[PDB]
């Protein structure tokens, strides 16, 4: 009859509630009318092609604007002293001083300074001209199309796959490991040795000459013969100019380690070697499980056989195979969990080990990328912990999982939750305690009475890596051991050079200030996990509500009876954790940024002393770096940072607006609207017009969402405005 | 006092408030308007005409001398590190 068509019960709502909820439930296929397992699987599979189409289109546009409105070529010729251009600006509201200030990077008009690091990435892989960027944009536009073509193709009956096909896991793993991971990594190693590395050295190897240009002097033979060391005889000289055939070796596969001294980035030869190396593990690994040829494993049976006799895990993992394969919420929560972990692994390894040329010197880009991925990694983790409860409520079969490791979690759930409470309470009581204590004496003017615990455990790890600072005498920095000498030159000499670099971010110096914050982050992790698992383990029910299983993942509440039951659903527990997640990542990004902007200014001394007490954070970090930001537009002038000053205030406004939906609740607003409904009816010249949807206050759950969205958007945008401007201003 | 299942209307605020006026008309000048306002009375046809009337906005911006689209000229700042 009406929108939403997928929900008839929703479509018959006379109020404005239907339009809202029609949007918020469009992707929840399992709740749609007359849903079948068949319809469920190839809706996702088709929605999957839709997502790919967006990514390729989004990436196509990036290659387009940089080629059309970005200099790039000007950037290539002097990567150190030119600012990359994202795209042009066209805004009628712009005053002349605006068009003025934003004209940068040698552009004919006002543009935006790119902080995505696409310039360094594209330059490192071998893109040298705008023409190259266009061909990529066209190719991605074409890739974006065939994704839609495949999406449309499998929605057709003559090409649609069976659910069982989707549930054949043994073969999907075998291909994804061997093909999706292995081959793609192998193919990339080819681009590196054919284009990236030779493009780095100085030769332009492209489609019209790649067929006639050897990647290596010696033939393809040495690989096939067996002697592969010949691919490492002649590496690039330390004093090598990128994009210049100066001090350029011939080797296409090395393990030098450390950084290319001019670019401060990892060697391309190391990477061409890396991907080639990992491709194999993936390639062999993608041949573990059984398919149609008579050899291979059975995942189920391996899970079945893993039962420790004599307790204490019970039935082990029996029936666990079918619980996962029949539940795509388990799979997603399992996927987000793994993806979320390596998302941070990207953030941690990309600032410590820069992969692209001239990215380490672009301090605004480095800060942005780390902060970017940590918040991305943050939200992903809350999703892995969100599809968890949904699995328990919608897809969990208690009987089929009788006394296995999964079912043993629900029967001692009070143990996991209470100790998470203890660990959270422990960390909080002392981390906050040590902080406040330190502020007291500095107020009292006696900073020599502070509790400054030296992170001696972590410093012991640093010395174990090769850092000759401190007197620890541990592996890779000791007097006699099998570890360092296993270096056998190769990685160690180039890498040990890199670790004792006082300039790079590769293993910075840490102290008492680094101790307190790491505990704050540990507090943030534990508490967030406490909230999320408690929502998961009590998703099917508690003692306050034993039949929570019968109400679904998201419901408003259970009423004011039995003392009150506000925010008792597993959905709300997620919604509460999102707050704690933002706080945690907030502390992480604060800690990363401040320690770096003090390092970049050549003044780590200020961080080492001000980070030990909380007033230092608010003043020497928050207050101190805001001056240039908040003067983006002044009652006297107008700078290029005016965008960020405005967005800074914008973020504050969205943030505070969420507070309205989180503090004030529905019954007040509904009664207010009822008076407004009366008004409109009794007002002449306005009676002629009537609404087609009954005006009602937002729902209890909707408001918690809407408020959280405001809270999260303002949270991000405010810090984004500050992270960029404060860093861009000083550089 | 006065509820009548017979007429459900007066029972409710069905009645038009005395602001209704079903009186006569206005001068014959209408004969003119009815002639020239006819093409816009069709609906849907008018919906389209106005949207394609958005072709005006394109025309007005493609050609516009006095909107800030020029620096006007300056020598740009380097500026924090060039």
């Amino acid at each position: 009859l009406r929108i939403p068509r997928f929900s008839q019960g929703l479509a018959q709502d006379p109020t404005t509630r239907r339009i809202w909820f029609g949007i918020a439930t469009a992707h929840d296929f399992e709740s749609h009318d007359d849903i079948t397992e068949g319809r469920l699987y190839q809706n996702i599979f088709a929605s999957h092609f839709g997502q790919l189409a967006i990514i390729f289109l989004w990436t196509s546009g990036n290659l387009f604007h940089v080629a059309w409105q970005g200099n790039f070529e000007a950037w290539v010729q002097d990567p150190f002293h030119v600012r990359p251009i994202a795209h042009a600006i066209w805004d009628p509201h712009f005053g002349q001083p605006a068009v003025e200030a934003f004209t940068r990077g040698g552009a004919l008009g006002p543009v935006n300074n790119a902080y995505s690091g696409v310039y360094q990435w594209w330059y490192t892989i071998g893109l040298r001209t705008n023409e190259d960027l266009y061909t990529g944009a066209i190719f991605l536009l074409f890739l974006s199309f065939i994704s839609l073509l495949a999406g449309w193709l499998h929605l057709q009956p003559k090409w649609k796959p069976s659910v069982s096909w989707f549930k054949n896991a043994e073969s999907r793993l075998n291909h994804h490991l061997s093909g999706l991971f292995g081959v793609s990594s192998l193919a990339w190693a080819g681009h590196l040795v054919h284009v990236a590395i030779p493009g780095s050295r100085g030769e332009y190897v492209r489609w019209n000459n790649f067929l006639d240009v050897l990647p290596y002097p010696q033939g393809l033979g040495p690989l096939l013969t067996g002697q592969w060391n010949l691919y490492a005889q002649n590496p690039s000289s330390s004093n090598h100019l990128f994009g210049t055939t100066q001090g350029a070796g011939t080797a296409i596969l090395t393990i030098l380690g450390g950084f290319h001294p001019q670019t401060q980035s990892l060697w391309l030869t190391d990477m061409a070697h890396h991907h080639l190396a990992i491709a194999f593990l993936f390639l062999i690994g993608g041949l573990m499980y059984r398919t149609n040829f008579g050899i291979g494993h059975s995942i189920k049976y391996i899970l079945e056989a893993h039962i420790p006799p004599g307790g204490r895990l019970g039935r082990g993992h029996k029936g666990l195979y079918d619980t996962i394969n029949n539940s795509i919420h388990f799979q997603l929560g399992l996927a987000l969990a793994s993806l979320g972990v390596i998302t941070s692994l990207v953030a941690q390894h990309m600032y410590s080990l820069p992969a692209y040329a001239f990215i380490a010197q672009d301090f605004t880009t480095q800060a942005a990328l780390y902060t970017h991925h940590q918040y991305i990694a943050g939200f992903i983790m809350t999703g892995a912990f969100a599809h968890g409860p949904i699995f328990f409520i919608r897809d969990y079969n208690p009987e089929q999982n009788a006394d296995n490791v999964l079912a043993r979690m629900l029967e001692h759930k009070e143990a996991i939750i209470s100790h998470l409470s203890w660990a959270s309470l422990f960390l909080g009581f002392h981390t906050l305690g040590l902080y406040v204590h330190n502020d007291v004496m500095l107020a009292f003017g006696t900073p020599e009475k502070q509790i400054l615990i030296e992170p001696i455990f972590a410093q012991w790890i640093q010395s174990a890596h090769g850092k000759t600072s401190y007197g620890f005498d541990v592996l890779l920095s000791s007097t006699n051991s099998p570890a360092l000498n296993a270096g056998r030159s190769i990685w160690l000499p180039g890498w040990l050079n890199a670790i004792n670099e006082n300039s790079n971010s590769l293993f910075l110096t840490i102290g008492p200030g680094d101790f307190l914050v790491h505990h704050a982050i540990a507090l943030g992790l534990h508490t967030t996990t406490l909230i999320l698992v408690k929502g998961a383990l009590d998703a099917r029910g508690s003692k306050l509500m034993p039949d929570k299983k019968d109400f679904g993942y998201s419901f408003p509440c259970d009423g004011p009876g039995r003392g009150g039951t506000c925010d008792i659903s597993a959905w709300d527990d997620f919604y509460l954790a999102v707050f704690w997640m933002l706080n945690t990542i907030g502390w992480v990004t604060f800690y990363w940024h401040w320690k770096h902007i003090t390092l970049w200014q050549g003044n780590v001394s200020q961080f080492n002393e001000s980070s030990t007490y909380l007033m230092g954070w608010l003043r020497d970090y928050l207050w101190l770096n805001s001056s240039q930001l908040i003067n983006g537009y002044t009652p006297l002038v107008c700078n290029s940072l005016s965008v960020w000053a405005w967005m800074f205030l914008f973020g504050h406004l969205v943030w505070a607006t969420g507070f309205m939906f989180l503090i004030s609740w529905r019954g007040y607003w509904q009664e207010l609207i009822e008076t407004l409904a009366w008004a409109h009816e009794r007002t002449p010249l306005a009676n002629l017009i009537r609404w087609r949807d009954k005006p009602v206050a937002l729902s209890i759950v909707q408001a918690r969402l809407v408020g959280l969205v405001h809270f999260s958007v303002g949270y991000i945008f405010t810090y984004a405005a500050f992270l960029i401007a404060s860093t861009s201003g000083k550089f | 006092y006065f509820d009548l299942e017979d007429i459900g209307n007066t029972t409710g605020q069905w009645d038009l408030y005395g602001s209704d006026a079903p009186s006569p008309y206005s001068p014959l000048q209408s004969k003119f308007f009815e002639t020239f306002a006819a093409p816009f009375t069709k609906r849907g046809l008018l919906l389209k005409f106005l949207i394609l009337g958005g072709g005006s906005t394109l025309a007005y911006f493609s050609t516009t001398a006095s909107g800030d689209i020029l620096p006007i000229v300056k020598g740009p700042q380097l500026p924090p590190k060039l």
Binding site: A88, W90, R692, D693 | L47, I51, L58, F61
Partner: peptide
């Protein structure tokens, strides 16, 4: 060139919001 497109990026909301409104009240 680039002064023709951001407005059709604003004609489009006018068109989209109108069409969607008709779709949701139907």
């Amino acid at each position: 060139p680039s002064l023709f497109v951001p407005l059709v990026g604003l004609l489009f909301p006018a068109v989209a919001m109108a069409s969607l409104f008709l779709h949701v009240e139907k």
